[PDB]
Amino acid sequence: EANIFCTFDHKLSIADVGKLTKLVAAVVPIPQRLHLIKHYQLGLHQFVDHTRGYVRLRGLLRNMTLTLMRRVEGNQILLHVPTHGLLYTVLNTGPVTWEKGDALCVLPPLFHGPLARENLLTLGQWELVLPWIVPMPLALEINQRLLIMGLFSLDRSYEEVKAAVQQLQTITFRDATFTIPDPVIDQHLLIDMKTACLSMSMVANLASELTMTYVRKLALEDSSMLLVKCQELLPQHVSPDDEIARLSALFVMLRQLDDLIREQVVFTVCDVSPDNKSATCIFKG
Amino acid sequence: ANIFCTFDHKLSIADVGKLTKLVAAVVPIPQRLHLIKHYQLGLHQFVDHTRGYVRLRGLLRNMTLTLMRRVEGNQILLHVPTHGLLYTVLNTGPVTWEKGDALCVLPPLFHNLLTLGQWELVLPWIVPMPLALEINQRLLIMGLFSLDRSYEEVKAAVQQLQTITFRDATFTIPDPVIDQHLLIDMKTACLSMSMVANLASELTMTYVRKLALEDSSMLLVKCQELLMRLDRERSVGESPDDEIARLSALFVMLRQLDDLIREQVVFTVCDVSPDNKSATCIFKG
Amino acid sequence: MENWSALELLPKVGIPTDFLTHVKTSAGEEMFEALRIYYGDDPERYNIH
Amino acid sequence: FAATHNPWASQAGCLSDVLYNTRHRERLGYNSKFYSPCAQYFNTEEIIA
Amino acid sequence: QALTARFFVPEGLVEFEAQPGALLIRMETGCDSPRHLYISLYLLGIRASNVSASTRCLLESVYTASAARAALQWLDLGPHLLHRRLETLGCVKTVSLGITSLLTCVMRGYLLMIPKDMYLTWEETRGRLQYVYLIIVYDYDGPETRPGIYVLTSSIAHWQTLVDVARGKFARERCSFVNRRITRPRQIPLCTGVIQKLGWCLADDIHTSFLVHKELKLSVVRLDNFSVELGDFREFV
Amino acid sequence: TRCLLESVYTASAARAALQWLDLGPHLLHRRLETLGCVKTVSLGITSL
Amino acid sequence: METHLYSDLAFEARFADDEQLPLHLVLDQEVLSNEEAETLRYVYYRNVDSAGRSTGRAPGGDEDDAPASDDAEDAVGGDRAFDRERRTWQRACFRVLPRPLELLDYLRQSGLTVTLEKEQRVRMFYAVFTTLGLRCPDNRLSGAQTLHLRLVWPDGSYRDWEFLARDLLREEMEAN
Amino acid sequence: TQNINTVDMGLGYTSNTCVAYVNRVRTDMGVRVQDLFRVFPMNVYRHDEVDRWIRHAAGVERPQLLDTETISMLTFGSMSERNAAATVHGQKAACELI
Amino acid sequence: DEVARTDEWKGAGVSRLREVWDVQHRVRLRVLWYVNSFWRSRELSYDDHEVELYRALDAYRARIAVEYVLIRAVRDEIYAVLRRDGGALPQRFACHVSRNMSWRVVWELCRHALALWMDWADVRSCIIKALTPRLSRGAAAAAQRARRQRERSAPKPQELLFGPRNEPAEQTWYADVVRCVRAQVDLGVEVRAARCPRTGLWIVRDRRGRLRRWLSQPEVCVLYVTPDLDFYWVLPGGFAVSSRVTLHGLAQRALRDRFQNFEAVLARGMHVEAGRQEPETPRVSGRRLPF
Structure with missing residues (x-):
């Protein structure tokens, strides 16, 4: 149920065992949620295939159950999925700087700036890449920017989309550096674009007669920096209970438009050591 | 998850006698530090003139909402709740409670003799x-009807909507705009509302074209038919960088709304004591 | 990297150690060749292969 | 607190860069046995390093 | 660990509900006297859309009371707004009989009888673990209103991919939704559908069996070793 | 292999010798002279 | 069926900017083979005017009638003429039905109330569905215009079929 | 939990087994043919009605689609054809070539 | 009641099924005509002039005539180069040749091969597939950059040692193969040529280094074009005719509208970056349910 195991295949050199026990309380995903498994199901090396899709990769990663590594005693590793609400601990692998209070989520590994690219393990062919x-x-x-790469990709040639993703593939986060590896369009990206397009058009339809000119009257009467910077990108009936129902429909359309870039809260920190290596996150996985 | 709180200010026996009736109330704190001064306790460190309600509600969703358990001589023992455990919460709000009601926590809008010297004792x-x-819906409408209050039927419309209603519960929700000047959080919220409405109405006409060179669903052609009726009502109403900026502006004004859109439940009530001053509940999360 | 569990479990020599700067300042600026800063309480020394 | 005190000398690819940065000086060819006391203020190939 | 409350059910709503595989659902009513009725999920099937003809006629005989009459009146008070009044409360641990009966309802931990028209899946039920959801859809192929309620049993734990494949299976409902918006420029149709989970169960604990009340039988699919978890009312288009 | 081993001898002396090899009016057999095999290296800056 | 009405409503939609009228069409196995249909990606259309060049160029003339000068640096005079040829083509909608089917019966399985004057039983092996948009800048349509199909494979090759606009609208234009 | 380790002290092969005596045959050793329509449920003919004629001429009922990547990660396998009501011979398999 | 426009469009139905052809009488295609389309409610006319049809057929004559006037200018250049050298053509191709053989027959066979090649000209030929890489997007910039890179100064030792390092003995041509005796003109083929460094001559090969062996046979002749507008007419015996293909008699826009090289547009299953290995095709076929 909860405490699961992973039976290995090879002989275990002391360097790989040291690399394994230095990865105690770190995140690993599993496909099937069984009692005992083989080593092929651990990590993301089975799931990864190049020139197949980052969006498909995060789609299959979004369904997996996470686990934390502890108490390796040779030829197997006791994994333990965390229960909901109980406070667990996580040793991070990726070089993403954390801060206390901030909720955390899972992602596929993306290409680093300096590209350290430590495989964390050297076996026959199954390496250990980690989310x-x-x-x-x-x-x-990054989910927003990949969906904007989607909505900008269509009806275009290679040249303008290349000159735009030369800016758009670079994403910093608190003076770090990152780049998105393989933004290739999938059928699922067309699916997400179709849902977002229906959502934004449904937002556009049921707009009222004062919401569509609120920025216009606001830029008329007052003046500020965000006012002109949002203006650069551009009564008769008063029955406000109809506006209550109208904004209720607008609110379910807004949450449906928002929940195509949202990935749910996998963790939230409570205490992080000031070397940004281990933290205590209060959630399941 | 026991949290001690202290007071550098003196507490006479009248003060603690005023305090001891609040034996288990929902109090927020920023983080789970162990022994914390009372200046970080309470919502008083966020509420000011130029910050307003919506900024405070955005500051509510990242705080932790703990429960008082006991009172000592000069320390207060807060028990931080966890998922699965049930608690007897005393009611602080004006609204009555019923069985099975999923509950939420909100900033206090207008409302009993609970103070401290130059420190406002405040509970959500x-x-x-x-x-x-x-109330989020009504307050967003009252934010939308702020700048246009030169007439009377807009003022009478706000006068109609200033009185909220519920089961035996009518309140005058306070006007966020004062002397025809709104608070900046609600102003930016309704600005983002009008901005996503205008950007939807000005971009779905190109994006249904950009998507529909692919497979054409009957949903998509009826969406385009709805856009034709909307463009008819618009006409009776009268470079990659621009669409890149349009899409990024669309999604940042989408991104800055989920604290007003997503209303995460905190408590789920169980069997209630009569007089409706307190209730047992499962904490969710 | 060395066996820091061998540094932890084996007996040592008690020395009145002192140097000129703070300990964490000499650690974060790498005064020495190779360092190892576990910050909480690691269970790794109680595992022996 | 001025950004520059010699615009012929403090910009990349200037006069004194191509006369005194050793990486630019290799592209022109020079007696490497000669010592130049200005190049220690212009060897940004390893001032960065 | 089975967190449990108890509620009052009148003499006209014990029907099809004395068995443990039942669900009390608080429905907010507009009339001032009850303000809510603790109706059955099998009472939601009497105004469903996946039902057959003979499944309707047997249900209208067993729920023949003025309380159920007023409950269906308050159902038809506001259409396409049921989940603005619907509220599930886990399931039923133990039924104690009586006129104003008080029955204990499990909400969390460990302690489900479903009519066959409301249970469906897009799978060969090959998942080891399965997750059950309350999926209602609002439909406008009928000229006024069609609410269609189902329970759902899928191996996809994650919410976003599940509602993605659900709207890929119920896209005709969204076609009818935009068709209703274009055919009525005054009505405000709120949501396409509602997703709310009901915990997880096991594949080998799913059967089809025989539920009889008042000599009235029903072929009933069952999730025997049930478990409850309430990820509450989300809405999807 | 040539593109590989040109990516390792990118110091001044190697390419200086490469320029020296193909400059005179002679071939390589009156330009080179064989000694044998190296077994040790001191490896300072000027090695031995 | 579900592809023609989109560009019908879309050429009704953008009638303010460009003065375009639709032409829905289906194509059989006589046009192209099935392996040319199962992988085909997109279709392009061009309206080449009667005594002129196209409708994507400037109204009166352009600078790209010069001799080619027998060189490489000005083999096209620069990539701006390449951009002009990318501009003169527009993209149409596309649908592929890779099953043998009866066209009147396929529209009868949909809600299309077809009323034919004769039971012309057309039986081909696959149905591509597209809409050429031929235009007239003035509201009067010249019957000497030329429509240009363009069908491109993912490999990149193409077979430009093209036809004048007189046998197209000799009957239905007169049937208005 | 008893961790039990083993060391084979023989240089070469030191343990010789042998299949000694058979007692029963769990498979039927029948000739009932393995249906390829079950193991390839995607393949439909081009024209519809000749396909319906072929499916009627065989015993397979309907072409069924195949599972996508996320559910195949969530499931372990297909396991399509269920148990028949008559089992008096054991499990069966017989495929062939041409 | 408010009936939607798509409901009336679906309940409309097609009026009649028309079917038309092309100019060359090669492809028929079937055209519907819906009744509730907005094409009826536009109130447009139809002025079918006769001289407009005359000028339209003139423009169509020009559009077909592009590559064929290019081929006839090619043939004029063959005869012009054969005259201006006096008929004493040189050898430019590496082939072992004899002397004790009458070359009276091979000249007549080369003339017959020229006539039979001109009998079977086609849109799938040498000069068009040589011009299509020139007609590309960045071919002009790559050509002028190759012009600037082929013309460099003397390598100074300063830039030889410490500067950045420096960077094509194989060319991808195009060929038309005429078989004179069996009368099978092979239209268009790829070939890969090199300088055989024992001498200063060319050697042609296939994609696997097959060393194309037609040039030994007296029954065939070949035409070679390169992406730098070079022209090599080859009869057996390795003797060649070298010239430049002309383009002064052709409009620029004729070459653009006829055989422009295409640059890709984005679609499903295609990488946003370019120059990568692609996934599988869409391939919506009649073998699978549409999933």
Whole structure:
């Protein structure tokens, strides 16, 4: 049920065993949620295939159950999925800087700036690549930017989309550096674009007769920096209970438009050591 | 998860006798530091003139909402709740409670003799979820009807909507705009509302074209038909960088709304004591 | 990297150690060749292969 | 607190860069046995390093 | 660990509800006297859309009372707004009989009889673990209103991919939704559908069996070793 | 292999010898002279 | 069926900017083979005017009628003429039905109330569905215009079919 | 939990087994043919009605689609054809070539 | 009641099924005509002039005539280069040749091969597939950069040692193969040529280094074009005719509208970056349910 095991295959050199026990209380995903498994199901090396899709990769990563590594005693490793609400601990692998209070979420590993690219393990062919634990702003912005790469990709040639992704593939987070590896369009990206397009058009339809000119009257009467910076990108009936129902429909359309870039809260820190290596996150996985 | 709180200010026996009736109330704190001064306790360190309600509600969703358990000589023992455990919460809000109501926590809008010397003792409202969504809805409408209050029927419309209603509960929700000047959090919220409405209405006409060169669903052609009726009502109403900036502006004004959109439930009530001053509840999260 | 568990479990020599700067300042600026800063309480020394 | 005190000398690819940065000086060819006391203020190939 | 409350059910709503595999659902009513009724999920099937003809006629005989009459009146008070009044309360641990009966309802921990028209899946039920959801849809192929309620049993734990494949299976409902918006420029149709989970169960604990009340039988699918978890009312288009 | 081993001898002396090899009016057999095999290295800056 | 009405409503939509009228069409196995249909990606259309060049160029003339000068640096005079040829083509909608089917019966399985004057039983093996948009800048349509199909494979090759606009609208234009 | 380790002290092969005596045959050793329509449920003919004629001429009922990546990660396998009501011979398999 | 426009469009139905052809009488195609389309409610006319049809067929004559006037200018250049050298053509191709053989027959066979090649000209030929890489997007910039890179100064030792390092003995041509005796003109083929460094001549090969062996046979002749507008007419015996293909008699826009090289547009299953290995095709086929 909860305490599961992973039977290995090879002889175990002391260097790989040292690398394994230095990865205690770190995140690993599992496909099937069984009692005992083989080593092929651990990590993301089975799931990764190049020139297949980052969006498909995060789609299959979004369904997996996470686990934390502890008490390796040779030829197997006691994994333990965390229960909901109980405070567990996480040793991070990716070089993403954390801060106390910030909720954390899972992501696929993306290409680093200096590209350290430590495989964490050297076996026959199954290496151990790991999903990253990334906070809410960086994860939300990278999902947003991949969907904008989607909505900008269509009806275009290679040249303008290349000159735009030369800016758009670079994403910093608190003076770090990152780049998105393989933004290739999938059928699922067309699915997400179709849902977002229906959502934004449904938002556009039921707009009222004062919401559509509120920025216009606001830029008329007053003046501020965000006013002109949002203006650069551009009664008769008063029955406000109809506006209550209208904004209720607008609110379910807004949460449906928001929940195509949202990935749910996998963790939230409570205490992080000031070397940014181990933290105590109060959530399941 | 026991948290000690102290007071550098002196507490006479009248002060603690005023305090001891609040034996288990929902109090927020920023983080789970062990022994914390009372200046970090309470919502007083956020509420000022130029910050307003919506900024405070955005500051509510990242704080932790702990429960008082006991009172000592000069320390207060807070018990931070966890998922699965049930607690007897005393009601602090004005609204009555019923069985099975999913509850939420809100900033106190207008409302009993609880103070401290130059430190406002302040606890958040506990409320049923329908009044929570209704009050965010009504307050967003009252923010939308702020700048246009030169007439009378807009003022009479606000006068109609300033009185909220519920089961035996009518309140005058306070006007966020004062002397025809709104608070900046609600102003930016309704600005983002009008901005996502205008950007939807000005970009879905290109994006249904950009998507529909692919497979054409009957949903998509009826969406385009709805856009034709909307463009008809608009016409009776009368470079990659621009669409890149348009999409990024669309999604940042989407991103800055989920604290007003997502209303995460905190408590789920169980069997209630009569006089409706307290109730047992499962804490969710 | 060395066996820091061998540094932890084996007996040592008690020395009145002192140097000129703070300990964490000499650690974060790498006054020495190779360092190892566990910050809480690691269970790794109680595992022996 | 001025950004520059010699615009012929403090910009990349200037006169004294191509006369005194050793990386630019290799592209022109020079007696490497000669010592130049200005180059220690212009060897940004390893001032960065 | 089975966190449990108890509620009052009148003499006209014990029907099809004395068995443990039942669900009390608080429905907010507009009339001032009850303000809510603790109706049955099998009472939601009497105004469902996946029902057959003979499944409707047997249900209208067993729920023949003025309380159920007023409950269906308050159902037809506001259409397409049921989840603005619907509220599930886990399931039923133990039924104690009586006129104003008080029955204990499990909400969390460990302690489900479902009619066959409301249970469906897009799977060969091959998942080891399965998750059950309350999926209602609002439909406008009918000229006024069609609420269609189902329980759902899928191996996808994650919410976003599940509602993605659900709207890929119920896209015709969204076609009818935009068709209702274009055919009525005054009505405000709120949501396409509602997703709310009901915990997880096991694959080998799913059967089909025989539920009889008042000599009235029903073929009933059952999730025997049940478990409850309430990720509450989300809405999808 | 040539593109590989040109990516390792990128100091001044190697390419200086490469320029010296193909400059005179002679071939390599009156330009080179064989000694044998190296077994040790001191490896300072000027090695031995 | 579900692809023609989109560009019908879309050419009704953008009638303010460009003065375009639709032409829905289906194509059989006589046009192209099935392996040319199962992988085909997109279709392009061009309206080449009667005594002129196209409708994507400037109204009166352009600078790209010069001799080619027999060189490489000005083999096209620069990539701006390449951008002009990218501009003169527009993209149409696309649908592929890779099953043999009866067209009147396929529209009858949909809600299309087809009323034919004769039971012309057309039986091909697959149905591509697209809409050429031919235009007239003035509201009067010249019957000497030329429409240009363009069908491109993912490999990149193409077979430009093209036809004048007189046998197209010799009957239905007169049937208005 | 008893961790039990073993060391084979033989240089080469030191343990010789042998299949000695058979007692029963769990498979039927029948000739009932393995249906390829079950193991390839995607393959439909081009024209519809000749396909319906072929499916009627065989015993397979319907073409069924195949599972996507996320559910195949969530499931372990297909396991399509269920147990028949008559089992008096054991499990069966017989495929062939041409 | 408010009936939607798509309901009336679906309940409309097509009026009639028309079917038309092309100019060359090669492809028929079937055209519907819906009744509730907005094409009826536009109130447009139809002025079918006769001289407009005359000028339209003139423009169509020009559009077909692009590559064929290019081929006839090619043939004029063959005869012009054969005259201006007096008929004493040089050898530019590496082939072992004899002397004790009458070359009276091979000249007549080369003339017959020229006539039979001109009998079977086609849009799939040498000069068009040589011009299509030139007609690309960045071919002009790559050509002028190759012009600037082929013309450099003397390598100074300063930039030889410490500067950045420096960076094509194989060319991808195009060929038309005429088989004179069996009368099978092979239209368009790829070939890969090199300088055989024992001498200063060319050697042609296939994609696997097959060393194309037609040039030994007296029954065939070949035409070679390169992406730098070079022209090599080859009869057996390795003797060649070298010239430049002309383009002064052709409009620029004729070359653009006829055989412009295409640059890709983005679609499903295609990488946002370019120059990568692609996934599988869409391939919506009649073998699978559409999933």
